[PDB]
Design a protein around this ligand. Structure first.
Ligand SMILES: [Mg+2]
Ligand SMILES: [Mg+2]
Ligand SMILES: [Mg+2]
Ligand SMILES: [Mg+2]
Ligand SMILES: [Mg+2]
Ligand SMILES: [Mg+2]
Ligand SMILES: [Mg+2]
Ligand SMILES: [Mg+2]
Ligand SMILES: [Mg+2]
Ligand SMILES: [Mg+2]
Ligand SMILES: [Mg+2]
Ligand SMILES: [Mg+2]
Ligand SMILES: [Mg+2]
Ligand SMILES: [Mg+2]
Ligand SMILES: [Mg+2]
Ligand SMILES: [Mg+2]
Ligand SMILES: [Mg+2]
Ligand SMILES: [Mg+2]
Ligand SMILES: [Mg+2]
Ligand SMILES: [Mg+2]
Ligand SMILES: [Mg+2]
Ligand SMILES: [Mg+2]
Ligand SMILES: [Mg+2]
Ligand SMILES: [Mg+2]
Ligand SMILES: [Mg+2]
Ligand SMILES: [Mg+2]
Ligand SMILES: [Mg+2]
Ligand SMILES: [Mg+2]
Ligand SMILES: [Mg+2]
Ligand SMILES: [Mg+2]
Ligand SMILES: [Mg+2]
Ligand SMILES: [Mg+2]
Ligand SMILES: [Mg+2]
Ligand SMILES: [Mg+2]
Ligand SMILES: [Mg+2]
Ligand SMILES: [Mg+2]
Ligand SMILES: [Mg+2]
Ligand SMILES: [Mg+2]
Ligand SMILES: [Mg+2]
Lengths: 44, 100, 76, 63
RNA sequence: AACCUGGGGAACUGAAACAUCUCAGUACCCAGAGGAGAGGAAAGAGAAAUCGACUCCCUGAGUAGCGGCGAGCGAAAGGGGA
RNA sequence: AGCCAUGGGGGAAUCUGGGCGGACCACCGCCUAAGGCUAAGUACUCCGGGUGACCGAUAGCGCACCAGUACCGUGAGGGAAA
RNA sequence: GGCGUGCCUAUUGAAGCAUGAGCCGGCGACUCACGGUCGUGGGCGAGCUUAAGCCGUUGAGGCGGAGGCGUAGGGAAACCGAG
RNA sequence: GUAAGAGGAGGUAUAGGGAGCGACGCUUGCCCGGUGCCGGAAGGUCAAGGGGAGGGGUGCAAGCCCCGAACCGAAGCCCCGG
RNA sequence: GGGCAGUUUGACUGGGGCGGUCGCCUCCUAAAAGGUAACGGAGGCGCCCAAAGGUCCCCUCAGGCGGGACGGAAAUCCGCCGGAGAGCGCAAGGGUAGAAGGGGGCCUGACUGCGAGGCCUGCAAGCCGAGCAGGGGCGAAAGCCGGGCCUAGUGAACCGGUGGU
């Protein structure tokens, strides 16, 4: 399944790949946007 | 063109604004004129003199700048480089463009 | 039948030889695994690629148990 | 009469001031899905060509 | 004889296939006009608080754009002349 | 996807009118549709004249000569030699 | 007496039992236009050059800078500029 | 045949069109699932159009312009049967 | 809606057709660099994993012999022998316990902006990468991290979709 992570309180995406049935529903991994530096990134 | 295969036309167009229906928008055209040639002759340089004999060629706008030693005189121009304004400020006036 | 098949040549092996001058970063030798180990001023990548980190000459040093090492002696 | 500039080529390739030809890196719009940050960045910059450079010159000539 | 306007209007060919495109509003058919025909005194052009019917030649320009953005197609304003 | 034209349907107003300035709105601005005429500059060459680093009878118009002939075709049409 | 496998084309290879030509004479095939690219002779040189067209001529030349190439690049563009 | 019109036929289902067998003698079996055709006012699906909940552009606003859900929407196909 | 019209209906190929194949990876052929054909020999891929990853520390296999309650050729516990013959997600090869293999802790570098200099190479494409800046993870730290031991897991351009600038 093709996944795409969004940024908090902002509008930025990132390349990803989640798993369908395999143990993995959400994606709360941190990441680095262009504005400022380092903020948590949700799946969405 | 030819090869029979997909021509080297495999490349791609990043060039935006490549086209639009009503055609072209009417916008000003600044002519880059280096003050080195500007320094050649001396008196009172204006778009009139440059187009009359030089490097303007009926261009819509004028803009002096670049390398060279600026002679002492009034230089009427539509635009100036930050570095260009320095040489003339060292020995001359800074006549800006029109407005209306 | 059903046999005519083969991935094209990867063209690996020793690229640089001992007694050779080199810049900085030159892939000294490409390899399949660890047919050669790094060494003095010699790094490697994922594919086990051997490449200079400095400028100098290539040199080889077999050491039996340890293996065959390769390094570049700096000079200028 | 009057060579016609190959519009299909101009819209995708600009010539350097010297004599070289430059165009965007290929493969970066579709194949994408999750390639190494290196790839996507390497594909961001334009480049020079070789022989066919002369070929594409003989199009945008009037240009 | 050719030229001219209007009403109709192809295909080969090109795209190295082909169907949109191209050939081309060409060939041909038809009606009409006269030494010419057509067009013509803005419900215009288009950005200059500018020009000032129409027609033709330079140029603008292989630009603006058009295009299975392929092959290819291809203006106008403006300036200079009759 | 405006503008110019318009086969179908709906369908006004007369200067506080109406079109246009590339979908639409607003502002700024150009112009007055749904009647007709208008020379010249332009195109062509059956006809006459002038000229040619154009031909010189297998060339040059198909035809220098009683050729669109003889001859060939039902017929459009083809078409010499000299 | 010694020596000796036609011409052309096409071919890996032809004297060829591969193609073409009965013999002679004549007609017969890489051009021009415009645009481009490299070289080249020559003029001028940060300048260079004119197009329609007007004047003249009756095988004369001249005027005509509208326009075009060049003097700054880079970016998709706004823009900035020896960057 | 674009049409007018003509044939059909100045005929009328004991006639005319189409199709397959091919004097006549004895016969012409079983299979509607797939295909065609014939019958089927329900249901499903469906275009223009109708409808306008709701949403957008712009303007001081009156307005102008645009997007648009439920639902009413034919033949055809689905479906039922021969 | 073949009544009519305009078209397409591939290539390789010990002649075509039928059959098979067409891209990528592993090995052999390949003649001790590279490369190298054949409808030559012999196999795989069109994925998978938030832990099967980064890091810090700990830990070392398979098999063999003897002993042992169910089990018993082989579950699990003990001893000795045992340098790689196991494992490294999936083919094969090269590599590897002086870790790349098994476990626990913290955790998200499966970063953005770049890129000296290279291997390979007709083109395009592919592949490696020090070091730099911002900033962040593990560690006391020296330091490692720009995804999985590695070489397959893929698609120029065009045309269009969704979110921002
Ligand atoms: Mg980037
Ligand atoms: Mg130009
Ligand atoms: Mg055809
Ligand atoms: Mg064909
Ligand atoms: Mg056309
Ligand atoms: Mg007239
Ligand atoms: Mg004239
Ligand atoms: Mg013109
Ligand atoms: Mg043309
Ligand atoms: Mg239109
Ligand atoms: Mg109408
Ligand atoms: Mg009137
Ligand atoms: Mg008239
Ligand atoms: Mg002569
Ligand atoms: Mg006769
Ligand atoms: Mg021959
Ligand atoms: Mg032969
Ligand atoms: Mg030969
Ligand atoms: Mg012969
Ligand atoms: Mg032959
Ligand atoms: Mg013969
Ligand atoms: Mg030439
Ligand atoms: Mg009919
Ligand atoms: Mg009747
Ligand atoms: Mg009758
Ligand atoms: Mg009976
Ligand atoms: Mg509606
Ligand atoms: Mg129905
Ligand atoms: Mg191999
Ligand atoms: Mg080899
Ligand atoms: Mg070899
Ligand atoms: Mg792993
Ligand atoms: Mg092993
Ligand atoms: Mg480990
Ligand atoms: Mg691991
Ligand atoms: Mg390359
Ligand atoms: Mg690859
Ligand atoms: Mg740092
Ligand atoms: Mg295309």
């Amino acid at each position: 399944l093709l996944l795409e992570c969004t940024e908090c309180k902002r509008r930025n995406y990132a390349t990803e790949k989640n798993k369908r049935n395999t143990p993995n529903k959400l994606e709360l991994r941190k990441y680095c946007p262009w504005c400022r530096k380092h903020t948590v990134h949700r799946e969405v | 063109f030819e090869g029979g295969r997909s021509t080297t036309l495999m490349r791609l167009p990043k060039r935006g604004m490549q086209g639009q229906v009503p055609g072209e928008i009417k916008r000003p055209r600044y002519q880059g004129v280096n003050l080195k040639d500007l320094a050649r002759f001396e008196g009172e340089v204006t778009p009139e003199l440059l187009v009359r004999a030089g490097l303007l060629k009926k261009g819509y706008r004028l803009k002096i700048l670049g390398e060279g030693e600026a002679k002492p005189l009034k230089v009427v121009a539509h635009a100036f480089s930050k570095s260009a304004l320095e040489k003339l400020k060292a020995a001359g006036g800074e006549p800006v463009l029109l407005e209306a | 039948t059903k046999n005519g098949r083969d991935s094209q040549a990867k063209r690996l092996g020793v690229k640089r030889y001992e007694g050779q001058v080199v810049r900085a970063g030159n892939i000294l030798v490409r390899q399949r695994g660890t047919r050669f180990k790094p060494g003095k001023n010699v790094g490697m990548g994922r594919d086990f690629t051997l490449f200079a980190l400095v400028d100098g000459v290539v040199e080889f040093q077999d050491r039996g148990r340890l293996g065959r090492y390769v390094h570049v002696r700096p000079l200028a | 009469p009057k060579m016609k500039t190959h519009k299909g080529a101009k819209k995708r390739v600009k010539i350097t001031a010297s004599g070289k030809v430059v165009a965007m890196k290929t493969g970066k719009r579709h194949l994408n899905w999750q390639k190494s940050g290196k790839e996507i960045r390497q594909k961001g910059r334009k480049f020079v060509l070789a022989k066919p450079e002369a070929e594409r010159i003989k199009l945008l000539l009037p240009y």
